[PDB]
Amino acid sequence: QSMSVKGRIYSILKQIGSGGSSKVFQVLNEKKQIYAIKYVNLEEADNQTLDSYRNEIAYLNKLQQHSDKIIRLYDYEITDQYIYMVMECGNIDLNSWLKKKKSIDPWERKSYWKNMLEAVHTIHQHGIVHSDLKPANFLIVDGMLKLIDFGIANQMQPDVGTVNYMPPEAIKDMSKISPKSDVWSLGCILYYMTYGKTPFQQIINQISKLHAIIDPNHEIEFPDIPEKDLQDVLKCCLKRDPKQRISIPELLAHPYVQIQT
Numbered sequence: 001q002s003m004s005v006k007g008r009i010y011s012i013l014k015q016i017g018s019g020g021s022s023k024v025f026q027v028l029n030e031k032k033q034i035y036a037i038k039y040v041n042l043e044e045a046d047n048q049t050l051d052s053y054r055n056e057i058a059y060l061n062k063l064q065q066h067s068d069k070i071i072r073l074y075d076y077e078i079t080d081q082y083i084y085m086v087m088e089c090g091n092i093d094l095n096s097w098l099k100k101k102k103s104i105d106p107w108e109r110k111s112y113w114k115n116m117l118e119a120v121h122t123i124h125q126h127g128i129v130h131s132d133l134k135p136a137n138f139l140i141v142d143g144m145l146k147l148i149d150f151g152i153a154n155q156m157q158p159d160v161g162t163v164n165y166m167p168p169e170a171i172k173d174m175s176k177i178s179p180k181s182d183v184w185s186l187g188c189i190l191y192y193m194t195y196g197k198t199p200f201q202q203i204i205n206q207i208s209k210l211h212a213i214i215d216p217n218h219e220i221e222f223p224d225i226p227e228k229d230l231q232d233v234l235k236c237c238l239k240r241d242p243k244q245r246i247s248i249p250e251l252l253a254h255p256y257v258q259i260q261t
């Protein structure tokens with residue numbers, strides 16, 4: 001099977017993922033170049049769902065020039081019945097990669113972190129707060145992480161929504177959501193890449209889990225490691241008071257991401 005986007009024909013190699021009314025396909029152009037095409041069926045979409053998709057496309061388009069840490073969007077076709085997005089094809093999403101890895105190299109960990117910080121920082125510059133960061137939002141493209149989405153349009157699974165990365169300020173006001181909320185979530189991804197688990201993975205009851213995230217009395221454990229800077233980064237990221245939590249610009253000037261070994 002094949003598909004057409006703005007006159008250009010693409011052969012379907014395989015379907016990478018599915019989620020809701022969305023499907024991602026690995027495809028080839030006439031010159032045998034690989035792309036990932038995202039197909040959205042708008043035949044059952046309401047005006048709330050339509051506006052989410054339009055907002056995500058616009059931001060991905062705007063941010064293209066600003067950073068190479070944002071997944072590339074080469075073309076798109078939009079009608080009343082469907083959406084086609086011609087994007088770069090990555091090797092694997094971060095979540096799938098994390099589940100497969102028995103141990104993460106320290107160097108790989110730092111390089112990925114820098115990519116995450118640069119990607120998130122760029123969105124922040126335009127006034128966008130993701131508020132829903134998790135490993136699945138990142139794609140590995142040639143040993144470089146890139147941000148896939150702004151957590152608005154839809155969630156996809158390779159061919160269940162975790163609360164393990166949720167910042168305290170979100171649960172408290174049930175606005176306090178700020179660029180610092182993303183620091184907590186990025187902090188949780190780094191924590192997982194360091195200790196093999198999210199800061200609150202252990203508590204099974206989701207209500208107890210949510211209560212532990214917002215409780216200063218509940219203390220997050222930070223076992224000692226050879227990278228003292230990494231330990232500091234973690235602790236600065238996972239401060240429950242957003243006002244006391246470190247910022248992305250500050251993180252980019254930290255020893256952990258600027259100084260190796």
Ligand SMILES: COc1cc(-c2cnn(C)c2)ccc1Nc1ncc2ccnc(-c3cnn(C)c3)c2n1
Pocket residue numbers: 016017024026036038071087088089090091092093096139148156157158159
């Ligand atoms: C070979 O390509 C893949 C394989 C996997 C994969 C393979 N095994 N598992 C478990 C996941 C995930 C992403 C990709 N690549 C890829 N490239 C561009 C994309 C553009 C937009 N969205 C996705 C995406 C989002 N979620 N997923 C699973 C893929 C994209 N995924």
